[PDB]
Design a protein around this motif. Structure first.
Motif, PDB file in Angstrom:
ATOM      1  N   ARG A  14       0.815  -1.205   0.000  1.00 15.01           N
ATOM      2  CA  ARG A  14       0.000   0.000   0.000  1.00 15.01           C
ATOM      3  C   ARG A  14       0.850   1.258   0.000  1.00 15.01           C
ATOM      4  N   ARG A  15       0.420   2.211  -0.823  1.00 18.40           N
ATOM      5  CA  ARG A  15       1.160   3.452  -1.006  1.00 18.40           C
ATOM      6  C   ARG A  15       0.520   4.612  -0.240  1.00 18.40           C
ATOM      7  N   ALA A  16       1.380   5.327   0.479  1.00 16.42           N
ATOM      8  CA  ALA A  16       0.904   6.486   1.218  1.00 16.42           C
ATOM      9  C   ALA A  16       0.871   7.702   0.320  1.00 16.42           C
ATOM     10  N   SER A  17       0.066   8.674   0.773  1.00 15.70           N
ATOM     11  CA  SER A  17      -0.007   9.916   0.022  1.00 15.70           C
ATOM     12  C   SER A  17       1.235  10.759   0.281  1.00 15.70           C
ATOM     13  N   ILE A  18       1.482  11.708  -0.593  1.00 18.18           N
ATOM     14  CA  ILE A  18       2.476  12.746  -0.332  1.00 18.18           C
ATOM     15  C   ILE A  18       1.735  14.072  -0.308  1.00 18.18           C
ATOM     16  N   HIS A  19       2.318  14.995   0.459  1.00 19.91           N
ATOM     17  CA  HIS A  19       1.617  16.280   0.553  1.00 19.91           C
ATOM     18  C   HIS A  19       2.570  17.356   1.037  1.00 19.91           C
TER      19      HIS A  19
ATOM     20  N   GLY B  36      -7.393   0.242   8.277  1.00 18.04           N
ATOM     21  CA  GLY B  36      -6.418   0.729   7.283  1.00 18.04           C
ATOM     22  C   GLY B  36      -5.824   2.027   7.768  1.00 18.04           C
ATOM     23  N   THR B  37      -4.703   2.427   7.197  1.00 22.25           N
ATOM     24  CA  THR B  37      -4.012   3.640   7.628  1.00 22.25           C
ATOM     25  C   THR B  37      -3.461   4.405   6.429  1.00 22.25           C
ATOM     26  N   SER B  39      -0.860   8.307   5.702  1.00 24.75           N
ATOM     27  CA  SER B  39       0.367   8.878   6.272  1.00 24.75           C
ATOM     28  C   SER B  39       0.190   9.486   7.649  1.00 24.75           C
ATOM     29  N   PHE B  40      -0.985   9.952   8.025  1.00 24.96           N
ATOM     30  CA  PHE B  40      -1.179  10.474   9.376  1.00 24.96           C
ATOM     31  C   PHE B  40      -2.611  10.195   9.812  1.00 24.96           C
ATOM     32  N   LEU B  68       2.124  18.536  10.147  1.00 25.05           N
ATOM     33  CA  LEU B  68       2.351  18.239   8.717  1.00 25.05           C
ATOM     34  C   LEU B  68       1.707  19.284   7.807  1.00 25.05           C
ATOM     35  N   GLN B  70      -1.361  20.225   7.393  1.00 24.38           N
ATOM     36  CA  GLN B  70      -2.533  19.741   6.665  1.00 24.38           C
ATOM     37  C   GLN B  70      -3.841  20.241   7.255  1.00 24.38           C
ATOM     38  N   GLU B 113     -10.282  -2.927   0.312  1.00 20.56           N
ATOM     39  CA  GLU B 113      -9.753  -2.079  -0.759  1.00 20.56           C
ATOM     40  C   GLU B 113      -9.690  -2.788  -2.098  1.00 20.56           C
ATOM     41  N   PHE B 115      -7.284  -2.423  -3.873  1.00 25.48           N
ATOM     42  CA  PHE B 115      -5.851  -2.680  -3.867  1.00 25.48           C
ATOM     43  C   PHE B 115      -5.536  -4.131  -3.508  1.00 25.48           C
ATOM     44  N   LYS B 154      -6.623   6.153  -6.358  1.00 24.81           N
ATOM     45  CA  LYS B 154      -5.710   4.996  -6.316  1.00 24.81           C
ATOM     46  C   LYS B 154      -6.484   3.802  -5.749  1.00 24.81           C
ATOM     47  N   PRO B 155      -6.092   2.570  -6.052  1.00 27.69           N
ATOM     48  CA  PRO B 155      -6.792   1.405  -5.515  1.00 27.69           C
ATOM     49  C   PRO B 155      -6.862   1.382  -3.994  1.00 27.69           C
ATOM     50  N   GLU B 156      -5.924   1.944  -3.252  1.00 29.06           N
ATOM     51  CA  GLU B 156      -5.993   1.956  -1.787  1.00 29.06           C
ATOM     52  C   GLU B 156      -7.144   2.825  -1.265  1.00 29.06           C
ATOM     53  N   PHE B 173      -7.461  15.318  -0.196  1.00 23.10           N
ATOM     54  CA  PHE B 173      -6.938  16.378  -1.059  1.00 23.10           C
ATOM     55  C   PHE B 173      -8.035  17.004  -1.915  1.00 23.10           C
ATOM     56  N   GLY B 186      -0.927  14.141  -3.585  1.00 19.99           N
ATOM     57  CA  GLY B 186      -1.467  12.994  -4.302  1.00 19.99           C
ATOM     58  C   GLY B 186      -0.691  11.767  -3.829  1.00 19.99           C
ATOM     59  N   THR B 187      -0.569  10.851  -4.769  1.00 18.38           N
ATOM     60  CA  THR B 187       0.243   9.648  -4.553  1.00 18.38           C
ATOM     61  C   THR B 187       1.191   9.573  -5.744  1.00 18.38           C
ATOM     62  N   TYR B 316      -3.617  -4.722  11.211  1.00 20.63           N
ATOM     63  CA  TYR B 316      -2.722  -3.628  11.570  1.00 20.63           C
ATOM     64  C   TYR B 316      -2.354  -3.663  13.049  1.00 20.63           C
TER      65      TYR B 316
END
Ligand SMILES: Nc1ncnc2c1ncn2[C@@H]1O[C@H](COP(=O)(O)OP(=O)(O)O)[C@@H](O)[C@H]1O
Ligand SMILES: [Ca+2]
Ligand SMILES: [Ca+2]
Lengths: 20, 336
Positions: A14-19, B36-37, B39-40, B68, B70, B113, B115, B154-156, B173, B186-187, B316
């Motif tokens: 699984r890929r995390a977002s960037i921001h 699920g998780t 980035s924050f 961050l 956000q 997901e 994913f 994205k699939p996730e 976003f 984004g990703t 998780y």
């Protein structure tokens, strides 16, 4: 194969977002 | 569609202008397990005590959000998600905050997901990928007509529901913008070149990302991949794309028009808008109204065994949900 190159890479989970 | 969208905009604007706030509180739910998780943020399966229903509770630590940078994106996320209404968008059932955290409680989408199914199965057949793609095309037509850009396909972030249909999640976003914007977000695999090259961009980045999504669903890997984001950005900016031997000619034509670095040429961005995509040969068999109406047979229906089953989700590590006795960041999140 492209498949094999993808599966051996480090971004197959699984890929995390960037921001920035 | 123009009559439907017009009414849809009226409904959205009322909620945009006077958002829902504070519609539940933490002790109304028992927290069960992490689903699920990102980035924050962390999303947990929970059970609502008085109704018995399960939900998916997204928990954000306010101090992490501020650290961050956000805050605005998080206020956008909740303001927009509480205001939208479309069959392939996850429903926000409640939201609230406490001294430490922000909470967005959604319908629990139990099929997992996209994913995980995609990686396990390997790839989707073109009819299967096309069923999911059509739902995204319709959802982006809806969102863009409200002047919203989604920015994180994205699939996730796509969940499969009990009937095999998509529910889009993660409005982190999403942004209401007329004309251009500049945030690098984004990703990495899904970013359009104009995002990477910092020139300012618009809703056409969502149609690029649709091209990435369709590629990845049908190939089983992304059109631009590498071990590190900078290497991915290099490939995106080259724009060179290569296709699996098994892609149909129609799929390849569509993808060259979506993964188009030139915005005067990118499908979804031209004079006829989304209809260049809806009318493309790859979608010739798609009944656009039946998809909207959820009357099409899904190609795949995840196993479901009971309220609260999470077997379609990875496990998780769990962590305590702490609530300080001191209010954190109250002013910053006043409107949440
Ligand atoms: N409504 C939901 N139902 C079931 N699972 C969910 C739901 N929403 C999110 N998830 C799960 O939690 C993960 C993270 O949610 P997301 O909104 O993308 O948070 P983040 O912004 O931290 O990435 C998703 O990738 C998915 O696994
Ligand atoms: Ca996410
Ligand atoms: Ca997010």
């Amino acid at each position: 194969t492209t498949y094999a190159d993808f599966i051996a890479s480090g971004r197959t989970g699984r890929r995390a977002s960037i921001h920035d | 569609v123009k009559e439907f969208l017009a009414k849809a905009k009226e409904d959205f604007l009322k909620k945009w202008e006077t958002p829902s706030q504070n519609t539940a509180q933490l002790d109304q739910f028992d927290r069960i397990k992490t689903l699920g998780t990102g980035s924050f943020g962390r999303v947990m399966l929970v059970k609502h005590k008085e109704s018995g229903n399960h939900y998916a509770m997204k928990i954000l630590d306010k101090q992490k959000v501020v650290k961050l940078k956000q805050i605005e994106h998080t206020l956008n996320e909740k303001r927009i998600l509480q205001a939208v209404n479309f069959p392939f968008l996850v429903k926000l059932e409640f939201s609230f905050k406490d001294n430490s955290n922000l909470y967005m409680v959604m319908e629990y989408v139990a099929g997992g997901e996209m994913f995980s199914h995609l990686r396990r199965i390997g790839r989707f057949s073109e009819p299967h990928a096309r069923f999911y793609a059509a739902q995204i095309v319709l959802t982006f037509e809806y969102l863009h007509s409200l002047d919203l850009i989604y920015r994180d396909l994205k699939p996730e972030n796509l969940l499969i529901d009990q009937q095999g249909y998509i529910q889009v999640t993660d409005f982190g976003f999403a942004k209401r913008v007329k004309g251009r914007t500049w945030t690098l977000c984004g990703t990495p695999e899904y970013l359009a070149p104009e995002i990477i090259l910092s020139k300012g961009y618009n809703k056409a980045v969502d149609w690029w990302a649709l091209g990435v999504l369709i590629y990845e669903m049908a190939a089983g890997y992304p059109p631009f991949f590498a071990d590190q984001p900078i290497q991915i950005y290099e490939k995106i900016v080259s724009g060179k794309v290569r296709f699996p031997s098994h892609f149909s000619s129609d799929l390849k034509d569509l993808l060259r028009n979506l993964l188009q670095v030139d915005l005067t040429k990118r499908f979804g961005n031209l004079k006829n808008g989304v209809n260049d995509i809806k009318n493309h040969k790859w979608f010739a068999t798609t009944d656009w109204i039946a998809i909207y109406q959820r009357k099409v047979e899904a190609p795949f229906i995840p196993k479901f065994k009971g309220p609260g089953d999470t077997s379609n989700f990875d496990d998780y590590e769990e962590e305590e949900i702490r609530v300080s006795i001191n209010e954190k960041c109250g002013k910053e999140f006043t409107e949440f």
